[PDB]
Amino acid sequence: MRFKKHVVQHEETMQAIAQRYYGDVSYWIDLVEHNNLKYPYLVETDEEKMKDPERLASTGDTLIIPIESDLTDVSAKEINSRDKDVLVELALGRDLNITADEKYFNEHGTSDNILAFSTNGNGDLDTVKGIDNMKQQLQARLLTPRGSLMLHPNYGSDLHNLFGLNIPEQATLIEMEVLRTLTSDNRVKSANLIDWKIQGNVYSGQFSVEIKSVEESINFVLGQDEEGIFALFE
């Protein structure tokens, strides 16, 4: 259950509040009855409220409006930028940082024993959030061979076997495998080739990944309020 709570504003009236919220002034008597208010409902200052603190409310006192409010179906335009940042952060999850020391496991991508946990510098375990989290998960999936992870046959990639010849065919195989691996992630809305080239031994390519938009993540997290889990089991 959730309800709206209104702070009394300067020289406000109960009729104005009723019109503002219920869309009709007629509910002002219901508002009085629910809040248990005596006749001078909104006193000028606290000196009047001292006469009867129980039954009177002054400026800056909080009223309760029993309208069933719900965090979903709320216009994203009202939400504050920091609130949107936190919401997308929750949507994309928090996880322990393992992709630290990028250079090392970039020098040995195909091998095992390549990544490890790290500390945040404050004596606690390091954590990656939001975009850093997505980076970590996409790197780990691409680096993981498919079928090597226990309890998860399909998680991973087949790039360890695509160390083939230097022709456009193997390039296309790599590209298709990478697109499969990126598509496998639920959060990745789509992925597509940008550009590739061959330099004899070395292959080089780059991709573009569109994560779910702020609106979708906001809708998902605010929907999750009904359950209260606020966690990711994808």
Stretch in the footprint of its own copies (CB under 8 A) among 52-60, 107-115, 143-151, 168-176 = 143-151
Q: First and final CA of the chain: distance in angstroms? A: 27
Of 67, 71, 96, 231, the one binding another protein by CB under 8 A: 96
162 binds its own copies (CB under 8 A): no
Query: Least CB distance from residue 222 to another protein, whole Å?
Result: 25
150 binds its own copies (CB under 8 A): yes
Pairing of strands 127-129, 188-199: unpaired
Of the pair 104, 163, the CB lying nearest another protein is at: 104
Maximum Cα interatomic distance, the chain, rounded to a whole number of Å: 90
122 binds another protein (CB under 8 A): yes
- Reported as type and span, the H/E element at residue 67 is strand 62-68
Cα–Cα dist 98/101, whole Å: 9
Cα–Cα dist 216/222, whole Å: 10
CA dihedral angle for residue 51, residue 57, residue 58, residue 62, rounded to 10 degrees: 150
13 binds another protein (CB under 8 A): yes
- Using CB under 8 A as the binding rule, the residues of this chain from 144 to 163 that contact another protein are 144-145, 148-150
Cα–Cα dist 126/130, whole Å: 14
The answer to whether the beta carbons of residues 214 and 88 sit under 8 Å apart is yes
Answer with the entry of another protein, its own copies, none that 140 interacts with (C-beta below 5 to 8 A by kind): another protein
Query: Least CB distance from residue 153 to its own copies, whole Å?
Result: 6
The answer to whether the beta carbons of residues 25 and 14 sit under 8 Å apart is no
Which CA distances in Å does 163 have to 22, 85, 159, 167, 202? 67, 40, 7, 11, 10
Stretch in the footprint of its own copies (CB under 8 A) among 75-83, 97-105, 144-152, 220-228 = 144-152
164 binds its own copies (CB under 8 A): no
Stretch in the footprint of another protein (CB under 8 A) among 84-92, 128-136, 141-149, 198-206 = 141-149
- Using CB under 8 A as the binding rule, the residues of this chain from 42 to 61 that contact another protein are none
Query: Least CB distance from residue 56 to its own copies, whole Å?
Result: 23
Query: Which residues contact another protein (rule: CB under 8 A)?
Result: 11, 13, 15-16, 96, 98, 105, 112-119, 122-125, 127, 140, 143-145, 148-150
